[PDB]
Paper text:
Human [name] ([name]) and its close homologue CDK13 (CDC2L5) are unusually large CDK family members (1,490 and 1,512 amino acids, respectively) containing a central kinase domain with flanking arginine-serine-rich (RS) domains. Recent work indicates that these CDKs regulate transcription via assembly with the 65 kDa cyclin K1 subunit (herein CycK). Ser2 phosphorylation is required for transcriptional elongation and is performed by both [name]/CycK and CDK9/CycT (P-TEFb; the positive transcription elongation factor b), which are identified as orthologues of S. cerevisiae Ctk1/Ctk2 and Bur1/Bur2, respectively. Here, we report further structures of [name]/CycK complexes solved in the presence of AMP-PNP and containing variable truncations of the C-terminal kinase extension.
Diffraction quality crystals in space group P21 (but with different cell dimensions) were also obtained for the larger CDK12715–1052/CycK11–267 complex, which was mono-phosphorylated after expression without further CAK treatment. This structure was refined at 3.15 Å resolution and similarly contained two protein complexes in the asymmetric unit. The longer CDK12715–1052 chains are distinguished by an additional αK helix that was also observed by Bösken et al. However, the current structures reveal hitherto unseen conformational plasticity in this C-terminal extension, which packs alongside the ATP pocket in chain A, but at the back of the kinase domain in chain C. Strikingly, the ligand AMP-PNP, included in all crystallisations, is bound only in chain A where its interactions are stabilized by the presence of the αK helix. An unexpected feature of the CDK12715–1052/CycK11–267 complex structure is the conformational plasticity of the C-terminal kinase extension. By contrast, the C-terminus in the second [name] complex continues a path across the back of the kinase domain to pack within 4.3 Å of the bound CycK subunit. Interestingly, the αK helix, encompassing residues 1040-HELWS-1044, is formed in both [name] conformations suggesting that this secondary structural element is stably folded. When engaged by the ATP pocket this element acts to enclose the bound AMP-PNP molecule adding significantly to the pocket surface area. As well as contacts by His1040 and Glu1041 to the AMP-PNP moiety, there are stabilizing interactions with the kinase hinge region, including a hydrogen bond between Asp1038 and the hinge residue Tyr815. However, the full length [name]/CycK1 complex exhibited a KmATP value of 2 μM that was notably improved relative to the CDK12715–1052/CycK11–267 complex, which had a KmATP of 25 μM.
Numbering used by the authors:
A (entry chain D): 22 to 262
B (entry chain C): 718 to 1048
Write the structure that this text describes.
């Protein structure tokens, strides 16, 4: 199945078509996504485990409204599945201990009477909604594999991917996971981390004169598309880091 | 879009057994008529919900479509509480191919004796499925006779990927270690290796290769230490000579066999065909680095020219192919 939309079609989520302010969906999304990122690192979970739960979350609300499903409970459910999927599972008891703990007491009100049930029973439809496609890849993996094939000064690379990595963490709050393959997002954060640091990346590859260095990893990706991913991320630093 | 189809699509025949998560049923489909195995995933809340065993299986089998592996056809669900939802308690059903027997059941009778041409045929299929898994970086970590299925057509399929996990050579993280049934567990896991290799499955298949000839399991202890001696009593004792990197294993100097056995493998399995003994000798090496890989097992004199090709007679109609799913595996 396919999990990638073009920008023109994301203004047609079930939430918005039911008459929802787009600016508030982005709120609910950036909120919901960031929620998972914090709950996970507190439980001490792997970074790929964090990302799968987030990508599940973003994917779930492409077929459902935020009205019928409280933003904060779904995210907890997504992390629950993600733990089991990425083989870093936590009991649902331990996450609910984080549910009440790191969160506004009225934001916790989303879980209703029994967070366990509200999280556990929700898992049935979550699995169905993501069409039982449980393996999900991230820009993390490709970022390293590409940087290992870069031939130059290490402490420049060490700082290069150091900021490119953080950018992937940044991007998760947005629908980039719903827009581009993880490899192409990984190329984009290499492109961005290379520009603001003024590192010209070609000079470390087999062909130092082809400006568009990235085609050695991907195929026929235009510089236009890459800059689109970059801009969407720049708005994140413009307001919420 | 799995989990949308109805179980009413399937005519249930009977209960095969209680599985690792709920139960396993035999069933036919009213549409095609072909028979199917159903693994019942009863969802238990106030527990931990959807089991990882069912998750490992789904995640991997949707990437594994091969002739020698019982392939997951689809997933189906119970009824449809179109109202409320939240009332739940409905189960999910994993749909697989169907195999009548497993190697444990057949060999238990003491009636069935497989000719060398059959063992040549069975292993060739088994090592081709495991080679495929390892090529796609999946460890089975639960290979035993009861997990090796077989239909009347002679086709072998590897089953139960409920303990299977993805593997990378860069040594990312410690694994569970207490994996695989004790009888089919390699020496390195007995000594406490946490970051193990695909060569643990190759050991299990070797212990099965010996079982096809001796008609009985070649390593049969009850406790972990007693199992190590049984292995030492046959494959020789683990020591720096036969095995360079055992010293880096945790429970080595503590969990020792009674004496420093000389390797007695070719002596006790001498009745076995020459080239078959060559393979068994290799598949049961103590040092995992010097052990045989699945890719290599198919290049042995005992398996290299074993023609499973479906152009040579006889034509078997009841053989379950996978080029339907593999073609369909574009979407």
């Amino acid at each position: 199945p396919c999990w990638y939309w073009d920008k023109k079609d994301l203004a047609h989520t079930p939430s918005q078509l039911e008459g929802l302010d787009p600016a508030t969906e982005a709120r609910y999304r950036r909120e919901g996504a960031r929620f998972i990122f914090d709950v996970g690192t507190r439980l001490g979970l792997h970074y790929d485990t964090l990302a799968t739960g987030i990508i599940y979350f973003h994917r779930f609300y492409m077929f459902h409204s935020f009205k019928q499903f409280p933003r904060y409970v779904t995210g907890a459910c997504c992390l629950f599945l993600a733990g089991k999927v990425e083989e870093t599972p936590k009991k649902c008891k331990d996450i609910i201990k984080t549910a009440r703990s790191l969160l506004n007491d009225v934001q916790f009100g989303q879980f209703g009477d029994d967070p366990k049930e509200e999280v556990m029973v929700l898992e049935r439809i979550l699995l169905q909604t993501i069409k039982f496609d449980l393996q999900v890849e991230h820009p993390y993996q490709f970022l390293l594999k590409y940087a290992k094939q870069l031939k130059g000064d290490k402490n420049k690379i060490q700082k290069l991917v150091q900021m490119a990595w953080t950018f992937v963490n940044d991007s998760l709050c947005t629908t980039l996971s719903l827009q581009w393959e993880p490899e192409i997002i990984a190329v984009a954060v290499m492109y961005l981390a290379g520009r603001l640091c003024k590192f010209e990346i070609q000079e470390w590859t087999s062909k130092p004169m082809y400006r568009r260095w990235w085609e050695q990893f991907v195929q026929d990706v235009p510089v236009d598309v890459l800059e689109d991913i970059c801009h969407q991320i720049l708005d994140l630093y413009s307001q919420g880091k | 879009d799995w989990g949308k189809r109805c179980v009413d699509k399937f005519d249930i025949i009977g209960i095969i057994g209680e599985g690792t998560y709920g139960q396993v049923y035999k069933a036919k489909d009213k549409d095609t008529g072909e028979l199917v195995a159903l693994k019942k995933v009863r969802l238990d809340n106030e527990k931990e919900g959807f089991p990882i065993t069912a998750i490992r299986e789904i995640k991997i089998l949707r990437q594994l479509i091969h002739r020698s592996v019982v392939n997951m056809k689809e997933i189906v669900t119970d009824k449809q509480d179109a109202l409320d939802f939240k009332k739940d308690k409905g189960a999910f059903y994993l749909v697989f191919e169907y195999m009548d027997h497993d190697l444990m059941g057949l060999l238990e009778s003491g009636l069935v004796h497989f000719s060398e041409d059959h063992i040549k045929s069975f292993m060739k299929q088994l090592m081709e499925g495991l080679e495929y898994c390892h090529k796609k970086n999946f460890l089975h970590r639960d290979i035993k006779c009861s997990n090796i299925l077989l239909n009347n057509s002679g086709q072998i399929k590897l089953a139960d990927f409920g303990l299977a996990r993805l593997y990378n050579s860069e040594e990312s993280r410690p694994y569970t270690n207490k994996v695989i049934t004790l009888w089919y567990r390699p020496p390195e896991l007995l000594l406490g290796e946490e970051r193990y290799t695909p060569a643990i499955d190759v050991w299990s298949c070797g212990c099965i290769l010996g079982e096809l000839f001796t008609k009985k399991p070649i390593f049969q202890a009850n406790l972990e230490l007693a199992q190590l001696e049984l292995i030492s009593r046959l494959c020789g004792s683990p020591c720096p000579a036969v095995w360079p990197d055992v010293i880096k294993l945790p429970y080595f100097n503590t969990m020792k066999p009674k004496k420093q056995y000389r390797r007695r493998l070719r002596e006790e399995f001498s009745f076995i065909p020459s080239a078959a003994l060559d393979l068994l000798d290799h598949m049961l090496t103590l040092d995992p680095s010097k052990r045989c890989t699945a890719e290599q097992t198919l290049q042995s004199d005992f398996l290299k020219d074993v023609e499973l090709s479906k152009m040579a007679p006889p034509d078997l109609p009841h053989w379950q192919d996978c080029h339907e799913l593999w073609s369909k595996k574009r979407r």
